[PDB]
Amino acid sequence: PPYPNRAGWRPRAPEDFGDGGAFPEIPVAQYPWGKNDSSSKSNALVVQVDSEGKVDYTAIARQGHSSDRIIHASFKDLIPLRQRAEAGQIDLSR
């Protein structure tokens, strides 16, 4: 149901949301993806996300360390610095 006629019609599934995002003009408990009701203090590490929007398994490598510590934990750290796709101009100066 496009704009501006969704009155009376309530979404029942996340497919009823279109691609998602709760409809603010219908007063009802809307959840665009699902329910996280109560997790009984599950002691797992919280699954964080890296810069490009993917799962990060360096959170196991960095565990028990300070944030300012240099830790090589990926294959990118094995590549020579010129051949990395991040940059090409590096100031090698004291």
Partner: protein, 122 residues
């Protein structure tokens, strides 16, 4: 509170109600005489392995913690969480609705104490 006695070999376990009375009775009867001319051995008592005694000492621990928590929390929060009064249940629904029927806000937000908060507070 309890006076377990085992006459077959003659040893007693005396459970008072207070720390102060227990220590006063311990240091007051240290090598003190009974009716017979003997020297008593009044030590601290190792915990009983009787499952009942363990269960009731545990229950004393949780009721003491509950007493302190109920003193610390607002009485409105205690009643609204307690879930025995139907008035408390419907008060909980109406207060942790904020419109949007069928919401039922999380405990971390509904039962939250803070400077600003979203609650009657106190």
């Amino acid at each position: 509170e309890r006076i377990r006695v085992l006459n077959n070999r003659g040893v007693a376990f005396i459970t008072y109600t207070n720390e102060a009375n227990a220590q006063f009775a311990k240091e007051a009867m240290a090598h003190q005489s009974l009716d017979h001319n003997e020297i008593l051995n009044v030590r601290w008592a190792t915990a009983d392995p009787n499952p009942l005694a363990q269960k009731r000492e545990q229950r004393r621990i949780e009721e003491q913690a509950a007493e302190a928590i109920r003193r610390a929390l607002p009485a409105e929060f205690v009643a609204e969480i307690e879930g025995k009064d139907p008035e408390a249940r419907k008060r909980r629904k109406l207060e942790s609705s904020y419109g949007l029927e069928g919401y039922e806000a999380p405990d971390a937000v509904h039962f939250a104490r803070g400077p600003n908060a979203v609650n009657p507070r106190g």
